[PDB]
């Protein structure tokens, strides 16, 4: 019938939104702005809670199959660090698979879905009203919806129709970004790199594999006009960043970008949301930006989905802006903290010698890289007990693992007792009864995006907790 | 005789010198510039290895009289946190005493040991050969010796008379400190200062028990003359960083001080040498001028007796710099990395959020604690062995404990093996033969200063070691 959902931006924010959406019938309209997918890879990976996310989904088997794990030093500020032994998760990994990869991934999994992926279609216009959005295209056309997603990035549209405050910290250091060819041999450019790097820790060299290299070097002051730089202007920052240009040449890709923080004010406003970069913005540099922008994807999806349903409680919808308006907060505070510790100056030098010993205790090593691949989120969600707000990491069952029960996208109730019951609620939650499941708790309820509502062993106990997540018993 | 030592200078660095040398029937002259001894205490109290260091001369029991003892949090950049459990020390406190008061115990102490302390004795030059040092005096008077120890301060007279380099990083912040009675009471006062605290750290306020109290105001901007502030200017700083002066009038201290870290190149230059303040400067705020002056002098005292008492091996006087040069250069760093968690910038507030984290972990703030308090040094004397270099903490013996058999500023091999000898060295080495000696080594050589110098069971090993640290057998 009518569109449920329009999502603006084909990101792969909206497009993990899409996924989520269509598990629970939902129709799914993402306008892509651009008519072609774009092909320049931002993030070079994926972090833990990604790839958990992506199991839960039955995704991780393809994304393994695009991509190499591994487990090196470096993620927390460059500092180089053994993998902490003990990250609590079973996806103790980084995921190394190109952005341009996991995007094209996240298409064709929305797309056999069921989703209707719109390229070459730009929103340019909103009308909210008491029933539905209204998004006008660029070229006049007309879309009606019951929500709109605005998933169009750091300079969303949607977010700039709405007025919604984009407060923060301003830009006050620029960096440029080039993929260029090099009239020098690749072991000249590691060679500089590395002596460059002892000094001026913001710029770097990765190469990609057809001789072309990405270039990360600070830019002069800021820009006036906050464009495109042009090939010169990289080489007077290479110049005076590593004293040789490199002989760059033949630029396939020129960008500028800041170290602004801002995070938007209401990531809801009535019925239209914004999630992704179009509700926060960070620098790419010690940024975690794809990885939040999905998992804002995986809190939204089946919360808006539960809205189309007819069944979320009252409040389900805001939860979402109260769970993850918090997080972004964190992930821009703690990407400020990691700037810091690679600037030049000499103070926070001395800052970043002391981190450099704090890291080699396996408690830092291991709080810094929970904390900036996800896993140590924890929404408040009013309980005492230490699960209740956490994502459940996946544990083996009698036969088989957690994750493989997951890819429903439905409420879980994961049962040790023997005796609890959802019954009244079925069709959103289903019931894991397994007393061999490895996991030291009577039994926890699991929201659809894997974060425990509850935790006990009291069936009445059970019943007051279930309306809050999954509504009316039916 | 002729003086052996003069000391220019009668603070802690030069009084616990002068302590040091008279244990060894050194004649040595402190020539105090001022005519009466300073009242306005600088530092607060002691930490963990000055403490120790007191007690292994005998002297905590006085100082134990006249201060107290505490364990609250916030000894590292103001980071409130518990004090660490298990700090590896007898000897795990913070000893709160008035400096002065610190300086009449080092003056007592060194004047019953028969240093002879010349008050109103201000050294104005300086002439060395290959046999001593003659000291001029402001008024003419001229001083020989066979060696003469700057002990002058941070401004150190034989510092520049030397033309030893100082560098560092220069001045960019002033802070102002004011000893002054205020128009409001104490609650008010207090009120405002946690008020204030929360956006500039670099605030306080610390009541002396008068009706006077001590004020640390950032100053504006740096001053071209680097003189004392007026009454004025500490009305001007107080208004604009807490909205109020409360009324301060009648001074009686006003200052100034700035950020500066600098090191002297050469702690020694022929017979001539520098201790404390007149061999390194660093902020008084999160600085520990007072125990790292205070331990120059304990590394430096029985190696300057044993060159005067004929027995120091060639480099033994040479291992002053070599040892405590590093350690001033680790103070002064961590000292800028302390003072840039107190920095009132987005970005250094936002590392402050991620160490208060950190803190919490036990053996960070075990790290951050040890590391202050000094018990962390570590001479490199060359050795695998992880004790060799480092202090020796008190021990328990079969009856009493290690530190009360090292009053004689001697060396001590430790023996638990029944079977070790120091003859030949006796005079210079006691033979502490103890199999109940709670340390789980064969022996350890303890130097005068109680940093262990070797750890074995070889008697054939041991003999290779001594005479590295205790020249020749006789
Ligand atoms: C150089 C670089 C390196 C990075 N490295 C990392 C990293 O290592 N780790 C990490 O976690 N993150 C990293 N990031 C961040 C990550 O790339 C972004 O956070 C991620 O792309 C966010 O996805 P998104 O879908 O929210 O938004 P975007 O990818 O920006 O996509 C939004 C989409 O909206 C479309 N659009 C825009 N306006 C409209 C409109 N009006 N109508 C319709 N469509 C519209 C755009 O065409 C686009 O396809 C990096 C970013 C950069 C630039
Ligand atoms: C406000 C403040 C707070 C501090 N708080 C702490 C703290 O909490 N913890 C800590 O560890 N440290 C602290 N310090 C640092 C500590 O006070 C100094 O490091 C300590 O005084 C160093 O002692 P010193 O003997 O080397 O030098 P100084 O105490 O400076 O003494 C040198 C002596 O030389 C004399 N003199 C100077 N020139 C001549 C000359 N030409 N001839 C003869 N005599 C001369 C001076 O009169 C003086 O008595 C603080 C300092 C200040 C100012």
């Known amino acids: 019938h009518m569109i449920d959902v329009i999502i603006a931006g084909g990101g792969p924010t909206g497009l993990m939104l899409a996924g989520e959406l269509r598990l629970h019938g939902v129709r799914t309209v993402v306008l892509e702005k651009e008519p072609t997918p774009n092909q320049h890879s931002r993030s070079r990976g994926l972090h833990a809670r990604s790839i958990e996310v992506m199991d839960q989904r039955g995704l ?91 998933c169009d990035g750091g300079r969303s549209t949607v977010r700039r129709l709405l007025g919604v405050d984009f407060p923060g910290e301003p830009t ?102 914004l999630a992704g970069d179009a509700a926060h913005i960070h620098p790419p540099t010690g940024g975690q930006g794809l990885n939040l922008g999905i998992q804002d994807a995986f809190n939204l999806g089946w919360k808006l989905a539960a809205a189309i349903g007819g069944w979320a409680p009252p409040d389900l919808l805001d939860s979402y802006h109260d769970e993850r308006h918090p997080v972004a907060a964190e992930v821009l505070d703690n990407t400020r903290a990691q700037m810091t510790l690679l600037s030049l100056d000499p103070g926070p030098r001395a800052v970043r010698r002391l981190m450099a010993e704090l890291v080699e205790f396996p408690d830092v090593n291991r709080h810094l890289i929970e904390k900036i691949t996800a896993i140590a989120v924890r929404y408040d969600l009013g309980d005492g007990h230490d699960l209740v707000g956490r994502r459940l990491r996946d544990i083996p069952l009698t036969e088989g693992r957690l994750y493989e029960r997951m890819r429903g996208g439905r409420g879980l109730l994961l049962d040790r007792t023997g005796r609890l019951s959802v019954s009244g609620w079925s069709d959103r939650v289903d019931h894991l009864a397994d007393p061999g499941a490895a996991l030291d708790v009577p039994a926890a309820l699991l929201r659809p995006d894997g974060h425990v509502a509850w935790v006990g062993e009291d069936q009445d106990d059970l019943l007051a907790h279930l309306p809050r997540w999954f509504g009316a018993a039916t």
């Open 60 to 150: 991780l088997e393809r994304f393994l199959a695009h991509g190499e794990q591994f487990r090196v030093g470096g993620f927390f500020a460059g500092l180089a660090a053994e993998w902490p032994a003990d990250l609590d998760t079973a996806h103790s990994y980084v995921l190394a698979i190109p952005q341009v990869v996991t995007e094209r991934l996240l298409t064709e999994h929305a797309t056999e879905l069921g989703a209707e992926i719109r390229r070459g279609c730009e929103v340019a216009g909103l009308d909210q009203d008491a029933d539905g959005v209204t998004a006008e295209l660029a070229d006049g056309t007309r879309l009606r919806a019951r929500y709109l997603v605005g």
């Open 172 to 273: 006050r250091v620029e960096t440029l970004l080039a993929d260029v060819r090099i009239d020098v041999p690749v072991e000249t450019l590691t060679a500089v790199v590395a002596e460059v790097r002892k000094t001026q820790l913001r710029f770097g060299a990765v190469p990609a594999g057809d001789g072309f290299f990405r270039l990360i070097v600070p830019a002069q002051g800021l820009s006036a006009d906050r464009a495109a730089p042009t090939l010169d202007e990289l080489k007077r920052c290479l110049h005076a960043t590593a004293g040789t240009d490199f002989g760059v040449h033949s630029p396939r890709w020129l960008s500028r970008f800041g170290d602004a923080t801002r995070l938007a004010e209401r990531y809801r406003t009535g019925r239209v949301l």
